[PDB]
Design a protein around this ligand. Structure first.
Ligand SMILES: Nc1ncnc2c1ncn2[C@@H]1O[C@H](COP(=O)(O)OP(=O)(O)OP(=O)(O)O)[C@@H](O)[C@H]1O
Ligand SMILES: Nc1ncnc2c1ncn2[C@@H]1O[C@H](COP(=O)(O)OP(=O)(O)OP(=O)(O)O)[C@@H](O)[C@H]1O
Ligand SMILES: Nc1ncnc2c1ncn2[C@@H]1O[C@H](COP(=O)(O)OP(=O)(O)OP(=O)(O)O)[C@@H](O)[C@H]1O
Ligand SMILES: Nc1ncnc2c1ncn2[C@@H]1O[C@H](COP(=O)(O)OP(=O)(O)OP(=O)(O)O)[C@@H](O)[C@H]1O
Ligand SMILES: Nc1ncnc2c1ncn2[C@@H]1O[C@H](COP(=O)(O)OP(=O)(O)OP(=O)(O)O)[C@@H](O)[C@H]1O
Lengths: 578, 367, 379
């Protein structure tokens, strides 16, 4: 016990052990197991950061504090450091000698307890290529006799995969399931731990601060367990607050500080609205309405979803917005989503759902099951969302994927989570889910037969209802049906395209001006409501880019100047210049 | 009783060691039991307590507050899921039978197939059950198991393959929390080859993963929610009389699940549509949730009862359940409140009031 | 990188688990973040508490060297942790931290760099900075959950365009000293923009540096008669187009003629069907002049008409005339709704997964090429 163990009672007497809060049932069970006649070896198992090592050390702490029944008093606990014990055992027989010496000391003490943290680690000490006498076997006979008392601690996965694989050693230990506390219990734990962190960071935590920290760690941090992530938020906020006094921004830990820390850890936006981010959303609809003309209700819906999300009163565990932009070709379905991603400065996750035409392509989205070739890769959707938890998810032409794939988005839209082949839950609570399609358009482009022409306005909705399952359509935030582009919209669009062309020219040191009658003639030539705004860019191309490209690639416009376009009236052609 | 309980409750250790462990731990406990000097003989009740402590199962707790929890469980759930009383009753009675000892010998606490139309409290009542009982909810979105070979994810990869050390999701989740509520959401979307696991899980209450471990389902409330035939339930039949398509959806259930599967289901509870009073209660629940959200920001809210009637009439749609009510509450309140709260009068202060005007069918607001 | 360093210093001041784990994509500069924190420490441009601490970069090979005779590695590591414990002013930096998940004996895969630091990191006596990529972090690191919970993950995203420009301007002195060349600021901005535009398979803060270093190395090779000159937009553009396969500036060289007489040269080989040649040549000329679509192919053409009138002939002659590899895909092999699996590849877990796609790999290997789909109505 000289240089291989650490006397936990000595460390508790110098205040090196944090105070154990609650855990009365588990401690009682550990004491009951410890007072058994044989095989009196408790094994604490549970998830990571639930308090197993905490309980084992708090046992010695309470022993020093005297808050123990009059059977475990005077029993000093030693924690075993496997590395220190295995350090110098270079020669054969040496490790066994020192381990047997330690076991003799413990057995002759008849009173001490050996707490082997990470007890799954002692299944290998041997080197002579086999199932040698190594520490696992070197302690097997003693536990079956109850001469020494050993406490272990190992996570559920480690215990299930490594420890219990050795049946003989496993049956000698009593499993004690350390479940993660509740919200109230972890609140009490943080309350009891407050003096240490307050002395360490020289800050004070309000009760509301602790409550908000626990609640937000429960809500947002979903990859850690309670009594370890709540104190994580608390210690992080304390460390952040202690870095302020150098700038003399010293105060207590208020709820807003905890919220900022949590937003930082979960990589989500919480209260940045207090800064110059309210204006960002305030003119968001305006900033989009100057990039995508017509289709205003879509901008209204997107802006209002994002506003409800940022203000706080959004959905609890659902995506920020799940919309189905349906409408004819070239009306701005993809474009509004791309410009939305650009406006918020938020990452765009693009998924062309025409590559998912086969039912078995779902393995691309969520990964391949264990035992199959692509297992180490993981799903594309889930990994993308895990990397970018705050992003815009765009599913182009979702009607082109196999109809069975929408059942994946079922749980994404309803519960906001998606589990890939490793058990990781992709968090969709900060994702603006947009799916575009032209599903019900073909039925509206129908010529009726008879003397009376009938209104086909409801055919688009009928087809959409016949394509997407009712339980899928039932969880969409809105189905924004897009309308065709009108004449004035075509004017604004040709202006946008001319501005883009002018930027493309300015890249080459050239300038352009187009007369108003020339703009109107461009709008008149290639306008086609059945094709949206793509044929307008096509007409701009074949009318201006081709002659301009000939002038640019050959002579005249090399480092050219102000190119002027004007419309004729005798023939309705376009003029050009230098 | 110790030998019998160690036989039929402790299935990871062998016989002349688990009986001995029960006896030894009971003796040690009765030795520590003199917190009032009270040492007595070890009776059957103490043995049952030690065993329920070891095997991680609910014991005889009629002398506990658990008696009161199970007592008002139906009424407490009925205040969170309005309508659908028969499902809450079946769930509560199954849980009670399992607690009183008159459970099944080697079957899960319950294996219910929650079917019905969309938007009704199908997957919701299960979450509320897990919350009220305070037991861990094991949720499994079965729509990710469309491929026939995803069973390898449920029970792990066989020996000799890459995903061996990961294990199975379902088996490990059960082994961690033996007393839990298993929610197999959207069960009809999984490949039919996945139901064959639930076959033995429901008939024998056990499941063996790849590492040879036995997953014990004897305390798990297995609940599967489906939408089989929902496309039929929403269809208006041809004829002068519109038919009830419930029995059609039941025939679809029969055409999806094999008879040996439907044979061991404790009940197939066909949820029904929401009525108008149910919709009013749903609106009230949503308004309470919204008020909690607002009070999280220091903003109060009250809505005139006539305005709640207006919201209910605006959003009511029986063919779509209670989800459109959330959308209507959103469109009518959350957007104006959000515009007031981000950049408006509502920053850092609330006391918002809402009422309906009869001539214009609008709502009022303000500080 | 003010916020990343600020969060790292906030983590390093925690009472427990004060171990920042810098995880980001490959080439973002996490190693650069750590080494730059050290460099700031040596310059005093750090918060007060973060002064007077020296960062040790731990290399696994040097530690794992020669450690036979079971116990040697455990002794080495315990001595290292001991020397590190007595400092309270030392920070250990492990560059590829996903590689410390095993150093134990193969007999029993056991106590190693991981199971030896867990009690030390959880007890908060030593401080470690880590670095790993997402692919390794989510596959190797966060499998020992007890080890992952001891590290505070810090997302290191790739900088913006102008942030990258400022990084290039800060790093310019050393590259200029190495290559003995000068870079104009306009050339630096052009380098960053072109790296954003064309170099698609590498991340931002690294591909611009790559363009800079290659331009300097090449400009040190131009002086065959000692023609040392400063790197301008032109040379850097050529270096970028080396990967992009088409320079935007160099068209004024002996290539303006090729686009000038492309139509007449093709009409010398494909007689009749003049307007098809006109359209192809005009599209290529637009894309070369710079009026092309910033997110679309050079062209997307549908050739219709009776058979054997030169639909494939004009295309093969175009591929020959432009010196461009013709990618031919016969849509007669794709008459089934399940053949696209050979176009894009099979999903993970299926027999043809690691084989990859035909069309995708072809386009990736030949960025500048002609794509030909014969009998598109047959597919
Ligand atoms: N019962 C408790 N009361 C108060 N605080 C606690 C309790 N348990 C844990 N903690 C705190 O949570 C932190 C982590 O929990 P704990 O150390 O008990 O689990 P662990 O041994 O680290 O598990 P693992 O090693 O598998 O990750 C501890 O540093 C401790 O401060
Ligand atoms: N309402 C609009 N106002 C201005 N420009 C527009 C509008 N719609 C489209 N455009 C332009 O036309 C092009 C196509 O836009 P977009 O792809 O978003 O339409 P779409 O709805 O997605 O068509 P599809 O049905 O094929 O998906 C874009 O370059 C865009 O700039
Ligand atoms: N009977 C009800 N009383 C009150 N609220 C309800 C009821 N049903 C549903 N809700 C609410 O409407 C939402 C949807 O409920 P739920 O998820 O349980 O229906 P579902 O059957 O699972 O839908 P689906 O068949 O598409 O999977 C929930 O947020 C829930 O709160
Ligand atoms: N914030 C920065 N400031 C200055 N220079 C930088 C910055 N980031 C990166 N660099 C430079 O760009 C290059 C790439 O960065 P770095 O080498 O630090 O990342 P990395 O170690 O390769 O990350 P990984 O290990 O995941 O691949 C480096 O040469 C570095 O000098
Ligand atoms: N306008 C032309 N100029 C030169 N050669 C030509 C022309 N038309 C046809 N040919 C000759 O016909 C031969 C085959 O032509 P090609 O392969 O292009 O068929 P196609 O036009 O693509 O029609 P399809 O493949 O559907 O049968 C060429 O080798 C070519 O010599």
């Amino acid at each position: 016990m000289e240089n291989f163990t650490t006397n936990l009672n000595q460390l508790a007497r110098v205040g090196g052990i944090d105070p154990l809060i609650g855990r009365e049932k588990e401690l009682e069970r550990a004491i009951q197991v410890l007072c058994r006649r044989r095989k009196n070896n408790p094994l604490l198992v549970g998830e990571s950061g639930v308090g197993k090592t905490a309980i084992a050390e708090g046992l010695a702490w309470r022993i020093v504090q005297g808050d123990v029944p009059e059977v475990m008093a005077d029993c000093t606990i030693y924690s075993l450091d496997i590395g220190s014990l295995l350090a110098g055992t270079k020669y054969r027989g040496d490790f066994e000698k020192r381990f047997k010496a330690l076991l003799k000391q413990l057995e002759q003490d008849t009173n001490s307890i050996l707490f082997i943290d990470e007890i799954h680690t002692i299944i290998g000490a041997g080197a002579a290529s086999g199932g040698q006498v190594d520490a696992a076997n070197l302690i097997k006979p003693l536990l079956s006799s109850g001469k020494i008392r050993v406490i272990g601690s190992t996570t559920y996965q480690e215990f299930s995969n490594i420890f219990e694989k050795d049946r003989a050693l496993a049956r000698r230990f009593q499993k004690i399931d350390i479940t993660e506390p509740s919200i109230e219990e972890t609140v009490q734990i943080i309350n009891g731990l407050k003096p240490k962190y307050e002395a360490h960071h020289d800050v004070r935590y309000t009760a509301k601060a602790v409550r908000a920290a626990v609640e937000l760690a429960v809500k947002y941090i979903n990859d850690r367990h309670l009594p370890d992530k709540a104190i994580d938020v608390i210690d992080e906020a304390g460390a952040r607050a202690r870095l302020m006094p150098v700038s003399k921004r010293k105060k207590t830990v208020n709820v807003a500080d905890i919220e900022s820390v949590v937003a930082r850890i979960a990589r989500i936006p919480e209260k940045s609205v207090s800064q110059s981010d309210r204006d960002t959303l305030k003119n968001l609809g305006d900033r989009l309405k100057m990039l995508v003309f017509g289709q205003d209700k879509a901008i209204e819906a997107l802006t209002e979803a994002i506003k409800m999300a940022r203000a706080g009163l959004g959905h609890e565990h659902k995506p920020v917005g799940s919309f189905l932009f349906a409408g004819p070709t070239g009306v701005g379905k993809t474009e509004v989503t791309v410009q939305l991603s650009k406006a918020l400065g938020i990452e765009l996750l693009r998924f062309d759902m025409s590559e998912y035409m086969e039912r078995h392509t779902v393995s691309r989205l969520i990964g391949a099951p264990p035992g199959y070739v692509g297992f180490d890769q993981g799903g594309l959707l889930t990994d993308a969302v895990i990397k970018h938890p705050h992003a815009v998810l765009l599913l182009d032409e979702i009607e082109k994927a196999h109809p069975d794939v929408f059942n994946i988005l079922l749980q994404v839209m309803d519960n906001g989570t998606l589990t890939d082949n490793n058990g990781r839950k992709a968090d969709f609570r900060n994702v603006v889910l947009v799916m575009t399609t032209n599903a019900g358009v073909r039925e509206t482009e129908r010529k009726s037969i008879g003397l009376i022409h009938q209104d086909n306005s409801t055919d688009a909705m009928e087809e959409i209802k016949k394509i997407f399952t009712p339980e899928f359509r039932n969880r969409l935030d809105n189905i924004i049906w897009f309308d065709h582009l009108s004449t004035d919209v075509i004017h604004q669009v040709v202006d946008k395209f001319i501005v883009e062309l002018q930027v493309q020219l300015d890249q080459k040191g050239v300038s352009l001006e187009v007369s108003q009658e020339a703009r109107n003639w461009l709008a008149e030539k290639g306008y086609d409501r059945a094709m949206g705004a793509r044929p307008m860019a096509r007409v701009i191309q074949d009318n201006l880019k081709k002659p301009l490209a000939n002038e640019l690639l050959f002579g005249s416009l090399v480092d050219g100047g102000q190119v002027t376009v004007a419309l004729d009236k005798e023939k309705n052609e376009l003029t050009y210049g230098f």
